[PDB]
């Protein structure tokens, strides 16, 4: 009976909306028994099968729906969503374009296609497709919120106030009606949502993982209660999609090797395949055990593998970022599970026990913002591998082209050896600073830069144009290897003025909001002899920032844009700036470490979210509390003072340059020991039969 099957299908659509996915599946299946050739039911069943992670089975049913009904546009668009999740972008594109070819007025298909454009980096096209979707279906939370994120990426602040109001309205309505918020947890920090909303958004996304592990029907795992089977060693497993050329490896790649093999056995669980970089080689070589879970796509089998290794503490380095397999944590194969380093926020999830943070980043009085218990590292939870990756930047020299520390810079592993070969190096007190006078050698270096030559040879030493590192050694440029040559970096390479203050910020532009640019405008207005240095990150955001700046009263030539650079050049060119102005909305995190390694003071204003407080935690560990502002007023005054009181700038820059070495900030050895102590407090607490509690001391 058609009427019987219809009722089953329609009831299943209702169960689905209510979050009862298992019951939905049951009813779609009953519908198909009654009426086997029921296209709508095949397509709808396939949608919930996708939600349970049964992708191949979903594809089978979409194809069956389309065989039955060749112009079934819903089935094509839904099938594309499945193909997208399987990383078959071409297949998804073919489905969406077919669906729109069938029904040009199909809003969902326009929004789904826009998501491809967005993920491919084609923001103007994503924006155009999202706008079409919204024209067709004005009430469309997914399209609206993804559109708002596109606009954020390119700094389009048109009707920004109304935009924020609507985003919060949408999230409020979705949370009240028990639906999945269209704002992604990782983006929630960018909008004026309450802390309550932000935790709930994270919590509901974590519950998606549960839908996928419930179908597995696995019993709880039995966890070890002693270290006997591991000979007294604590077994730590690090789980990451980012073992390879990714910011996460640029921060912690040294840590697995620095764990004490007497007290710790380290397991690294890669969620990604080998990208062939030295980052991946290193972690694979230095971890006690390296397990490629990208070869075990079934989450049940992967979790089983983790459990069979006997892991005591399992560490989630992804959170809600691309490549995550949080289903592994939802299965709970380890007694203690902790969030660490990779994701700047709470999981909001029952299945994570601890978040590894610090007092500055996550003060006890805001513990309500987190679903995990706070586990404090003693200084900052943040770490970077800069001392290992870029030791060529530990020392520098300059050329007296007239003395400036940041107009024409030379760095190198072999720098001192080269300076010896010279009979006229002046040493200036400010360690100290070697200055090469304007002689024949200095002229040859400067001519290299002016002529855009790749490299020259002086007294047998190779001296490189800093813009040409990839042509000389591609591994040195990515940070996979330490450069061997003496490298030259100049303000002239980036069109920076030789005789003015350079304020920098090298973050992705999405971190900038109107309030932020206004603050920067004010600073520049008060330091007449100054520019702001930003990146084309992405390039299409540049004319927007320029418009809004001009609108705030700044001529165009006060803001200088540079392309995004290879990792090594990005860190090295930070030495050319006087001061970095951190973004209060979401701080530089990796980018903050990058700037400080260069010796560049960073002005920050910590907010209420974890992501807005990281730079202050880095600065506190570094020992520069004078760079941390308590409000916008102080941020502007600190920045203006650094730009106008040149003796104070010299002092503070010297303080950063010295303390990047003497403070614990870049000390991976000390960091690992402190992390090990925290791991133990976690373990002894559990071994004494206790549930997780704040480790804040």
């Amino acid at each position: 009976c058609p009427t019987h099957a219809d009722s089953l299908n329609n009831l299943a659509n209702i169960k689905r909306e209510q979050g009862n996915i298992e019951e939905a599946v049951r009813l779609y299946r009953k519908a198909l028994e009654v009426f086997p050739e029921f296209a709508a039911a095949h397509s709808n069943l396939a949608s919930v099968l996708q939600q349970q992670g049964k992708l191949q089975e979903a594809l089978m049913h979409y194809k069956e729906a389309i065989r039955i009904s060749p112009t079934f546009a819903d089935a094509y668009s839904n099938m594309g969503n499945t193909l997208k999740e399987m990383q078959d972008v071409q297949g998804a594109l073919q489905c969406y374009t077919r669906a729109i070819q069938i029904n040009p007025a199909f809003a969902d298909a326009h929004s789904n296609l826009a998501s491809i454009h967005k993920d491919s980096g084609n923001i103007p096209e994503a924006i155009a497709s999202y706008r079409t979707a919204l024209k067709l279906k004005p009430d469309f939370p997914d399209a609206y919120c993804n559109l708002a994120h596109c606009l954020q990426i390119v700094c389009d602040w048109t009707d920004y106030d109304e935009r924020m109001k609507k985003l919060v309205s949408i999230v409020a309505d979705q949370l009240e009606k028990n639906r999945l918020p269209s704002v992604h947890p990782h983006h929630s920090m960018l909008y004026p949502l309450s802390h309550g909303f932000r935790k709930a958004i994270a919590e509901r996304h974590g519950n998606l993982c549960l839908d996928k592990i419930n179908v597995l029907h696995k019993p709880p795992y039995e966890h070890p209660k002693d270290l006997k089977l591991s000979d007294g060693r604590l077994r730590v497993g690090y789980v990451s999609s980012d073992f390879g050329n990714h910011p996460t490896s640029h921060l912690m790649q040294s840590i697995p090797g620095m764990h004490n093999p007497d007290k710790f056995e380290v397991f690294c669980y890669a969620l990604s395949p080998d990208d062939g970089t030295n980052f991946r080689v290193k972690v694979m070589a230095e971890a006690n055990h390296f397990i490629d879970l990208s070869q075990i796509p079934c989450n049940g089998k992967a979790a089983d593998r983790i459990h069979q290794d006997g892991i005591h503490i399992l560490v989630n380095m992804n959170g809600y970022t691309k490549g995550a397999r949080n289903e592994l944590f939802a299965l709970r194969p380890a007694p203690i599970q902790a969030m660490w380093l990779g994701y700047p926020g709470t999981s909001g999830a029952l299945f994570m026990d601890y978040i590894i943070t610090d007092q500055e980043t996550s003060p006890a009085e805001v513990a309500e913002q987190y679903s995990e218990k706070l586990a404090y590292m003693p200084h900052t939870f943040f770490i970077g591998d800069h001392a290992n990756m870029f030791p060529h930047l530990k020392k520098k020299a300059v050329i007296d082209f007239k003395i400036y520390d940041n107009r024409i810079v030379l760095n190198g592993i072999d720098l001192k050896a080269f300076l010896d070969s010279l009979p006229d190096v002046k040493i200036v007190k400010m360690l100290n600073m070697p200055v090469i006078p304007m002689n024949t050698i200095a002229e040859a270096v400067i001519e290299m830069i002016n002529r855009g030559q790749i490299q020259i040879t002086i007294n047998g030493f190779s001296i490189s144009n800093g813009l040409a590192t990839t042509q000389i050694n591609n591994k040195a440029a990515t940070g996979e290897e330490v450069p061997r040559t003496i490298i030259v970096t100049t303000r002239s390479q980036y069109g920076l003025p030789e005789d003015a203050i350079v304020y920098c910020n090298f973050n992705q532009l999405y971190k900038i909001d109107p309030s932020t640019l206004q603050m920067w405008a004010n600073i520049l207005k008060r330091v007449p002899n100054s520019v702001l240095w930003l990146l084309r990150f992405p390039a299409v955001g540049e004319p927007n920032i320029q418009q809004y700046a001009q609108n705030m009263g700044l001529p165009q030539n006060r803001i200088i844009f540079s392309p995004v650079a290879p990792k090594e050049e990005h860190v090295r060119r930070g030495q050319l700036a006087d001061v970095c102005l951190d973004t209060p909305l979401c701080n530089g995190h990796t980018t903050g470490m990058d700037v400080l390694w260069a010796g560049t003071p960073m002005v920050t204003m910590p907010g209420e979210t974890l992501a807005s407080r990281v730079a202050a935690s880095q600065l506190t560990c570094l020992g520069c509390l004078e760079l941390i502002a308590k409000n916008r007023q102080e941020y502007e005054d600190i920045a203006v003072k650094l730009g106008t009181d040149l003796e104070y700038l010299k002092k503070v820059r010297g303080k950063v340059w010295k303390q990047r070495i003497s403070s614990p900030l870049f000390n991976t050895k000390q960091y690992t020991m402190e992390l090990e102590r925290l791991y133990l407090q976690m373990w002894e607490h559990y071994a004494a039969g206790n549930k997780p509690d704040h480790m804040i001391k």
Binding site: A5, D6, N9, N10, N13, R16, E17, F38, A40, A41, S43, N44, S47, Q50, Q51, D74, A75, S77, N78, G80, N81, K84, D108, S111, N112, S115, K118, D119, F140, D142, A143, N146, S182, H184, K322
Partner: peptide
């Protein structure tokens, strides 16, 4: 990875 929207088809 940007989320997508599944379309539910009602039987009539």
């Amino acid at each position: 990875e940007t989320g997508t929207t599944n379309t539910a088809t009602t039987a009539t």
